[PDB]
Amino acid sequence: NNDFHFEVFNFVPCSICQNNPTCWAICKRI
């Protein structure tokens, strides 16, 4: 268990993803 679980989040806000590519695949702009 490592490398960012985004399942634990209900959704991931695009605001905290920076330039991370995998974060920008699940993130949601508000």
Epitope: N2, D3, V8, F9, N10, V12, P13, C17, N19, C23
Partner: antibody, heavy 125, light 107 residues
Framework: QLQLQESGPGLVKPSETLSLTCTVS??????????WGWIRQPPGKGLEWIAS???????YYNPSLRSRVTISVDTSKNQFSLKLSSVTAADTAVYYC?????????????????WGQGTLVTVAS | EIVMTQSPATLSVSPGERATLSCRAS??????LAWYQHKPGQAPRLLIY???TRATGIPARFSGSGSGTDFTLTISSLQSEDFAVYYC????????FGPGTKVDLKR
């Protein structure tokens, strides 16, 4: 300077729900890219994180408590609250509220700075 | 599942010497590791994040080193003020804290 203050019942009957509120002062919760969370420490056990909430309504959950946690933010009164359902003696603890810095950029941030002073909850029949 | 262990559970230290403290992970956490100081009855305080980075307002006598599975927090020139429990916390996937080490003073 940023300060957090928990307030909530010292005593909650088992099989019921425990609710706490953090009142942040010396800084505004909205708008802010910080999550706001609750950590608890049972007597003579380690620290366990519970849940955090972001101004946007995103919620970061510790999976082993998700099913029992409801966490909310009242951006106007500068207050986030925690509700933990169906409590047992396993829930007796000091509950801290904290500012949760989450970031997935070049150097991750996923820590708690600063913290409140804790409030003791007791789950007693 | 990541497991944070710390050693020694407790440590007695002469006023002035250097207390070196250890945190260990089951799997690797890169450098996603922070250290907190918790004096009794007071609020926890973030000492180090990044596993090498002092948080603002923290004396230079506190330093963090290590990576992957082995980290060490060290307090050079220990003061009596410093008596407390120190927890590490990994954040490779989500917040997990170590059991903590109690730092006692000798006199």
């Amino acid at each position: 300077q940023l300060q957090l203050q928990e307030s909530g019942p010292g005593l909650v009957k088992p099989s019921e729900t425990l609710s706490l509120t953090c009142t942040v002062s010396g800084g505004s919760i909205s708008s802010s890219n910080y999550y706001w969370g609750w950590i608890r420490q049972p007597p003579g056990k380690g620290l366990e994180w519970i849940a955090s909430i972001h101004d946007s309504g995103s919620i970061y959950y510790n999976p082993s408590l998700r099913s029992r946690v409801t966490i909310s933010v009242d951006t106007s009164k500068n207050q986030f609250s925690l509700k933990l359902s169906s409590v047992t003696a396993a829930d007796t603890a000091v509950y801290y509220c904290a500012r949760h810095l989450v970031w997935f950029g070049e150097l991750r941030n996923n820590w708690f700075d600063p913290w409140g002073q804790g409030t003791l909850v007791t789950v007693a029949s | 599942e990541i497991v944070m262990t710390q050693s020694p559970a407790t440590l007695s230290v002469s006023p002035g010497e250097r207390a070196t403290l250890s945190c260990r992970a089951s799997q690797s956490v890169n450098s996603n590791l922070a250290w907190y100081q918790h004096k009794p009855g007071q609020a926890p305080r973030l000492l180090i994040y990044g596993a090498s980075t002092r948080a603002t307002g923290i004396p230079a006598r506190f330093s963090g080193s290590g990576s992957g599975t082995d980290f060490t927090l060290t307090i050079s020139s220990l003061q009596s003020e410093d008596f407390a429990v120190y927890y590490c916390q990994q954040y490779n996937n989500w917040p997990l804290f170590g059991p903590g080490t109690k730092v006692d003073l000798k006199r």
